[PDB]
């Protein structure tokens with residue numbers, strides 16, 4: 001997260017870090033057994049780490065649980081990033097408490113101008129690199145369809161939406177992928193892609209979770 005702030009230990013209790021010997025992506029806990037992340041975060045041998053603030057220090061509120069199954073969306077297209085969403089089932093149920101909590105799925109898509117919370121352990125610089133050990137937070141508004149649509153030279157589908165600032169300086173970045181965008185108390189987005197980070201006229205693109213609730217519910221009902 002570029003241009004954001006230190007969240008505070010466990011203030012975003014649905015935030016997960018995905019670890020394959022190091023943090024590589026974020027995720028959102030949607031109930032005691034399931035994490036939602038980005039399909040582009042798919043890899044073998046994932047350990048889900050809940051209750052994290054400093055990802056390099058055991059602070060006393062962590063739960064580390066191995067993934068038992070990963071399910072990339074059936075129509076994920078890595079070329080276009082369309083349908084960039086994946087479900088990860090935990091080997092055992094998380095113990096839910098104030099510091100480890102699920103986030104609700106939305107029942108409607110959020111509106112343009114709504115302020116959302118984006119969070120992660122990704123790069124904090126628009127140029128160069130610095131990776132934080134504690135969770136970073138950014139408040140940013142959903143952009144209009146028309147300003148999102150003209151935000152890139154690449155194709156933008158109705159399964160994507162934009163959140164951020166066209167002036168630059170505030171955005172998600174490398175390592176925040178898969179993590180949450182929460183608006184109106186629900187999971188409305190997944191950190192998906194962008195051109196660099198925090199570049200003028202180049203806002204973040206996010207998987208539109210409201211379009212996937214039926215598939216998530218179906219899938220977790222049978223796995």
Ligand SMILES: COC(=O)[C@H](Cc1cccc(C(=N)N)c1)NC(=O)CNS(=O)(=O)c1ccc(C)cc1
Pocket residue numbers: 171172173174175176177191192193194195196197198203204205
């Ligand atoms: C990979 O390096 C990066 O710094 C960012 C990471 C990233 C990930 C998710 C969200 C954001 C964000 N700013 N909201 C940033 N991605 C890129 O910069 C990728 N852009 S890119 O322009 O370099 C690019 C474009 C097309 C292809 C096929 C590969 C790479």
Ligand SMILES: [Ca+2]
Pocket residue numbers: 052053054055056057058059062
């Ligand atoms: Ca820790």
